[PDB]
Design a protein around this nucleic acid. Structure first.
Lengths: 218, 437, 224, 177, 246
RNA sequence: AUUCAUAAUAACUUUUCGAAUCGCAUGGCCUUGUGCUGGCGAUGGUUCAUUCAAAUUUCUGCCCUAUCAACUUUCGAUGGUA
RNA sequence: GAAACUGCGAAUGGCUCAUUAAAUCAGUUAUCGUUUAUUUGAUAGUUCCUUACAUGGUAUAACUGUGGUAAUUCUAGA
């Protein structure tokens, strides 16, 4: 089969073809989310620790956590689940999906590396892929940069240098949830408007009781 | 670094502890860069003209800035020297960094803890998140009973359980349950569920009411009530803004009337101990420090409100104690008089809260007389209660109190209707009787 | 970053300040089939008939009643100038947004017909214009500003020579508008006076520049 | 599967109506929620409109009121005693409306002792109450009628059986024992 | 049909719109609002079909979105807004106010209206209740809720309403001898004085009315609408003044 | 015509709501703080009223068949109570 | 301003006449027997009540990247 392995800390990943039924039998009868040993798999994975994270069988039906059957089943899938994306509101399709217990009939098994062993994997552990996007909320910029509450964010935003032709150029995200004179004005206005509302209501009610009392005194 | 260090403190578990403590102490510690400041020089002028076009303004600004620096060369030498010297201030979060490390390696603290208990017994100032992470560490401790000062830790830990933040309460229960004993083992889940907001009232009526299944036993009740009492104190300190929270506070007080006489008295003792009255009663009636703060005033206000609800729920069966209820009430009303006399009318917020305090305390006295009255003595405290009655009141009692039955006037009328209490009418030159007249 | 890659659609929003910053003043820079320049039985009357057909508003309807009774011919204008002028100024001071385009347009044309005799109204014509412009600030209407400053530009264009001969007084009259504490008042009023100064010849220009610099020392504190 | 139209019924004359249209959602029903005694569990069914409706599957406590002097206290429900529709419901301990349950007394008697200066069992004109209620207090449990719809509001509220009520239900219980 | 309808055919329209039977297949279904479906005039049927200020639906939408039309002082941008009866629609760029009132033939007649008369609006007090917190309110015939009314304002009355403030300037009681406008059934558009109110308990109260030429008719209370006292209407009546002739 | 509208008391609730949102503007004040105030309108939100609807329902009215005269009721047919 | 999330619409329209003989439907009533998105009009200071409001928190999509299946508007792991 094929072993799609990924090192989340570097966030790197590769695929390795596997042939020996010895290590394949190392894999059988384990479930998604169990633990294995890179030693028992092979020599290059000496000291490595994997957790069974997913896969697809020879016909493409992916593994679904939760179904405890090393075969294929028909599940009425609901809105917020995996291996299904609803096309419409409140729509439930009954889909075919492959069980969780690992067997022979699996074509791709997907693993993440939990404990790095003692030897260097070529593409996985050597290299790494940087984050695509940095923080966008005010407090997430603050947490990423460990900033003290005194210091302002708009000097610490992460800009990105893109270039076209000869003109280089920089981009920066809008810091959602930033505290702004506009927002202060809006809050101030809300309060003032509630005050004005209540005063108008009290004036009208006093006036009505005045009219009613005048009537009863006529 | 957080993923590395928990594998090498083992190689060195002394210097790492020293660094941790250095950071813990570090931000509170003063940092000074009092560098050398020379004598000021007033060398500056409008070197160039002022224009409106922006880039001309800019270059003119750069030139003027350089010129100013050179004219005031000396101090600018100092300043450039500083800026190239660079900083030495540790960022303020450094305490939280160290605390998170401490969390990462708890057993080292459990080992030493000698330089940590000073913080706890000073009650930290620190930030709430740091206090929380430190309490998380205390939960992570393994051999907690054998720490440096187990019992003083335990007392401060009960206080944190009495705190009002339910998350702080959860952490304090985690530590107090890290302390191991079979009774609290038996009631672990019950207390945790009592803290949980949804199951709160169901739990109260589940195992707190008497003569039921899953009720607390006798030895168990003796050993566990203080915990229950602190928890209920926090639940009570919940402030009543919405209907649900009003019902929460009312439920706490309405399960109170079934515990036991010493337990209720101890609950009220909690209230007073958060408050304070040995000022007067080490003096006679004189305030040592003019501590007229909103802090102490709202403290008193919460105390009197908790007492008013207590009366309205136990109105005949509840105990009274001079050192836990009677005296602090008197301190409260006396302080209200004092602040109202002492400070002018510019302090609207203080003044209004003081007046509200006076109202509530007087209603409470009237109530407690109505509700226990003849059932115990007063001679020990008749003089003092008469005093705090009569400093401001007998002077203008007739002028002020004539529209509706006031609480104070109701107090006087209870005094009159009850014979054995004639002692106040007696106690002055019938100032009360003359006021009524 | 002003709107520079236009949206495909047809109706954009264009808030008030955007409209004003996009606004400019020069009509000769501008151009179109001007009615008064087109038909020639009298300029005032030409604009007057076009507007009576186009505008349906209370104030201009009243004004049209009175004046259409009075004017129909150039000698009648010349005879009844004062009554017409007082009527125009009365309504302009009424300050009604729906009627101002016709009223100001007729004012410019009224000067065009009455040129070298218009100077005896000139001063308080200008007073009324500046009052209108400040009130327009109060009730923001970029259209009102366009109309008002174009009325000024047209008045200068029609009375080029005499105003040039007595230039400095114009600057004194406009200095409220010129130093006014609003970017666009400064901007537009200066553009109108710009046309006039560019028209002016050398000698009066020297006198003017001297007088204006001494005014600058007068308002040394002011930057506007 | 539970629908409540009147077109599957025999007519008044005893005729039989052939089907008129497919079943409709605006006449549906739903499975009864047999509320039983135990730790609380309450599902929330979503109803026409956006509205909600709290089916109680298991409920333990309740809100019960003493009508005579007019107070209300939260108590615990012990077990169903009698139910005017199904002795099967009595057997199975199913709370519904109009049930007769035995409830814990302690909050009520504590309020009584604290309000009227007198204990129970073993202003006195006002303190005088009914013999049957006094007897139940001595025992520790009261007879109270559940008077809400735990399948519609997720609650057991009730009133304590006073004079004529209690007379009738004691006769019924005693005669059925 | 499994929900509200969003379409209106052309034959199925209210008849008083005078919509030709060939120009299309659909009629403007009036959006929900103050007046009922069948006794409302949408703004497109008023701006295009009656005023002829437009020629299209897209022209009508251009006018509205350019923000010229105000229906009771407030600017309405919905092109099928159900303008109803006794309504005031102002076109300022034309300097016109329109009271929508019925013509003798049944149809809505444009009624040109001056400013001081466009300042207000009559409304048939139709439900007087006691709102939350104990403040009583009146409900008029076009949705409007008005709180703190005069205590002497009873169901079936008229209240003259200042539009600028949503308030009640004054009112008129439903008694015999008042002037009456009629809004339903065979006689709608007919103004007369109210002679008798034959009142049935559990059924429909009928009203006997008498127009100026002393011709008598009988309508329902649902369809009477009190305008003003004898000889003085509070509003300005359309021409012909609601007299049906030969 | 009402146990109506509405109000009040005591409690209860895995408990709701009581604006952490967005556009154009940039005015008023001064203890000169990057302080305090403030304009036009977008969206949303509880509770009633209205509107567009909806669900059930009262009265009367259907073609041929008596060589179909008894029908419906366990298996709800008619009514009572919960 | 593509993508995607969020909101809304998709319950209308259009088509056919199989069923259905007090059913449908027609005229006539009732809701003091009920739900109602929307529209429209009104409508929500609770000052205090003991130990951040210059504005909390964690996720996820599109995207980057590794893949599976003969195949679909299939989709897994990071």
């Amino acid at each position: 089969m094929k072993l799609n392995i990924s090192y989340p800390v570097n966030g790197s990943q590769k695929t390795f073809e596997i042939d020996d039924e010895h290590r394949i039998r190392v894999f059988f009868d384990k479930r998604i989310g169990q633990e294995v040993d890179g030693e028992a798999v092979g020599d290059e994975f000496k000291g490595y620790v994997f957790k069974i994270s997913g896969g697809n069988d020879k016909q493409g039906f992916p593994m679904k956590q939760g179904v405890l059957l090393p075969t294929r089943i028909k599940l009425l899938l609901t809105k917020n689940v995996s291996c299904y994306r609803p096309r419409r509101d409140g729509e439930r399709k009954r889909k075919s999906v492959r069980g969780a217990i690992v067997g022979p009939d699996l074509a791709v098994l997907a693993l993440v590396i939990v404990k790095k062993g003692e030897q260097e994997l070529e593409g996985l552990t050597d290299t790494t892929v940087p984050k695509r996007l940095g923080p966008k909320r005010a407090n997430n910029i603050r947490k990423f940069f460990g900033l003290s509450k005194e210091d302002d964010v708009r000097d610490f935003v992460i800009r990105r240098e893109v270039t076209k032709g000869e003109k280089t150029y920089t981009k920066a995200p809008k810091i959602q949830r930033l505290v702004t004179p506009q927002r202060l004005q809006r809050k101030r206005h809300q309060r003032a408007l509630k005050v004005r509302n209540a005063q108008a209501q009290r004036e009208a009610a006093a006036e009505y009781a005045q009219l009613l009392a005048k009537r009863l005194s006529e | 670094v957080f993923d590395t260090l928990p594998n090498v403190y083992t190689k060195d578990e002394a210097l790492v502890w020293k660094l941790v403590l250095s950071f813990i102490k570090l931000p509170d510690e003063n940092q000074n860069l009092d560098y050398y400041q020379p004598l000021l020089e007033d060398g500056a002028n409008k070197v160039l003209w002022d224009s409106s076009v922006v880039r001309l303004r800019d270059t003119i600004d750069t030139f003027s800035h350089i010129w100013s620096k050179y004219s005031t060369q000396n101090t600018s030498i100092i300043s450039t020297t500083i800026e190239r010297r660079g900083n030495t201030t540790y960022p303020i979060l450094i305490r939280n960094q160290a605390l998170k490390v401490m969390l990462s390696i708890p057993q080292v603290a459990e080992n030493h803890f000698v330089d940590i208990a000073p913080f706890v017994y000073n009650d930290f100032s620190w930030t709430e998140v740091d206090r929380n992470v430190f309490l998380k560490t205390l939960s992570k401790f393994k051999n907690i009973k054998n720490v440096y000062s187990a019992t003083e830790l335990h007392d401060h830990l009960m206080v944190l359980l009495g705190s009002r933040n339910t998350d702080v309460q959860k952490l304090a229960l985690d530590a107090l349950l890290a302390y191991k004993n079979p009774t609290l083992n038996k009631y672990r889940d019950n207390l945790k569920n009592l803290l949980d907001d949804t199951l709160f009232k169901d739990e109260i009526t589940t195992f707190l009411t008497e003569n039921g299944s899953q009720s607390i036993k006798a030895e168990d009740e003796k050993v566990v009530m203080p915990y229950v009492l602190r928890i209920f104190f926090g639940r009570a300190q919940v402030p009543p803004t919405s209907g649900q929270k009003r019902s929460r506070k009312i439920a706490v007080i309405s399960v109170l009337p079934n515990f036991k006489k010493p337990y209720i008295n101890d609950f009220l003792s909690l209230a007073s101990e958060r408050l304070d009255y040995n000022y007067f009663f080490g003096n006679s009636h004189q305030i040592n420090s003019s501590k007229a703060t909103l802090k102490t005033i709202r403290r008193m206000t919460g105390f009197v409100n908790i007492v008013n609800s207590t009366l309205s729920v136990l109105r005949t069966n509840f105990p009274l104690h001079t050192n836990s209820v009677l005296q602090p009430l008197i301190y409260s009303i006396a302080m209200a008089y004092y602040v109202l006399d002492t400070e002018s009318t510019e302090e609207v917020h203080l003044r209004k809260m003081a007046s509200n305090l006076r109202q509530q305390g007087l209603k409470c006295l009237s109530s407690v007389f109505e509700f226990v009255g003849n059932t115990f003595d007063w001679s020990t405290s008749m003089e003092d209660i008469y005093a705090v009655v009569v400093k401001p009141r007998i002077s203008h009692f007739s002028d002020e109190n004539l529209q509706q039955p006031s609480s104070l006037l109701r107090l006087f009328l209870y005094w009159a209707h009850n014979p054995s209490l004639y002692q106040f009418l007696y106690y002055d030159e019938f100032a009360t009787a003359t006021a009524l007249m | 970053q002003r709107q520079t890659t236009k949206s495909s659609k047809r109706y954009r929003y264009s808030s008030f300040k955007a409209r004003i910053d996009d606004l400019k003043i020069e009509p000769a820079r501008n151009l179109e089939k001007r009615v008064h320049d087109y038909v020639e039985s009298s300029h005032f009357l030409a604009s007057f008939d076009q507007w009576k057909e186009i505008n349906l508003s209370a104030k201009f309807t009243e004004f049209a009643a009175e004046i259409e009774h009075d004017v129909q011919t150039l000698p009648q204008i010349l005879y009844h100038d004062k009554k017409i002028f007082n009527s125009l100024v009365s309504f302009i001071n009424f300050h009604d947004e729906f009627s101002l385009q016709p009223l100001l347009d007729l004012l410019a044309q009224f000067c065009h017909d009455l040129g070298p005799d218009f100077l005896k109204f000139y001063e308080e014509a200008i007073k009324t214009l500046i009052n209108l412009l400040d009130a327009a600030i109060e009730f923001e209407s970029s259209n009102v500003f366009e109309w008002g400053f174009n009325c000024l530009a047209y008045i200068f264009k029609y009375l080029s020579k005499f105003l040039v001969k007595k230039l400095v007084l114009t600057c004194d009259l406009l200095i409220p508008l010129l130093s006014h504490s609003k970017e666009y008042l400064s901007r537009f009023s200066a553009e109108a006076l710009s046309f006039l100064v560019r028209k002016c010849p050398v000698s009066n220009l020297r006198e003017f520049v001297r007088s204006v610099f001494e005014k600058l020392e007068g308002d040394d504190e002011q930057t506007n | 599967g539970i629908s409540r139209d009147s077109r599957h019924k025999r007519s008044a004359t005893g005729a039989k109506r052939a089907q008129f249209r497919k079943k409709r959602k605006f006449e549906l029903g739903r499975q009864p929620a047999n509320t039983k005694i135990g730790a609380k569990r309450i599902h929330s069914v979503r109803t026409r409109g956006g509205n909600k409706k709290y089916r109680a599957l298991r409920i333990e406590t309740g809100n019960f009121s003493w009508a005579s002097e007019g107070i209300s206290k939260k108590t615990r429900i012990a077990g169903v005693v009698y139910h005017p529709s199904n002795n099967e419901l009595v057997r199975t301990n199913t709370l519904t409306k109009a049930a007769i349950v035995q409830i814990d007394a302690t909050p009520f008697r504590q309020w009584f002792e604290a309000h009227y200066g007198q204990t129970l069992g073993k202003r006195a004109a006002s303190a005088k109450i009914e013999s049957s209620v006094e007897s139940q207090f001595s025992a520790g449990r009261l007879y109270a009628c559940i008077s809400s719809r735990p399948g519609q509001s997720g609650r057991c509220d009730g009133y304590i059986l006073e004079g004529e009520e209690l007379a009738f239900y004691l006769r019924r219980l005693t005669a059925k024992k | 049909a499994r929900g509200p309808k969003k379409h209106l055919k052309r034959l199925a329209a209210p008849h008083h719109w005078l919509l030709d039977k060939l120009s299309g297949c659909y009629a403007p279904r009036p959006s929900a609002g103050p007046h009922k479906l069948r006794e409302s005039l949408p703004l497109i049927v008023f701006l295009r079909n009656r005023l002829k200020y437009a020629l299209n639906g897209r022209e009508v939408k251009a006018i509205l979105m350019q923000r010229h039309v105000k229906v009771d002082g407030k600017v309405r941008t919905d092109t099928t807004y159900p303008a109803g009866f006794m309504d005031v629609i102002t076109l300022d760029a034309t300097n016109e106010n329109f009271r929508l009132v019925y013509d003798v033939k049944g149809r809505f007649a444009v009624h040109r209206i001056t400013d001081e008369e466009a300042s207000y609006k009559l409304g048939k007090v139709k439900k007087v209740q006691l709102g939350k917190k104990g403040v009583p309110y009146v409900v008029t015939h076009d949705g409007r809720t008005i709180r703190y009314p005069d205590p002497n304002i009873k169901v079936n009355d008229t209240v003259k309403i200042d539009l600028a403030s949503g308030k009640i300037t004054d009112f008129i009681k439903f008694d015999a001898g008042k002037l009456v406008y009629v809004t339903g059934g065979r006689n709608l558009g007919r103004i007369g004085t109210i002679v008798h109110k034959e009142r049935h308990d559990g059924g429909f109260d009928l009203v006997h009315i008498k127009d100026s030429l002393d011709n008598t008719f009988v309508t329902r209370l649902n369809n009477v609408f009190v305008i003003g006292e004898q000889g003085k209407p509070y509003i300005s009546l359309p021409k012909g003044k609601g007299i049906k002739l030969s």
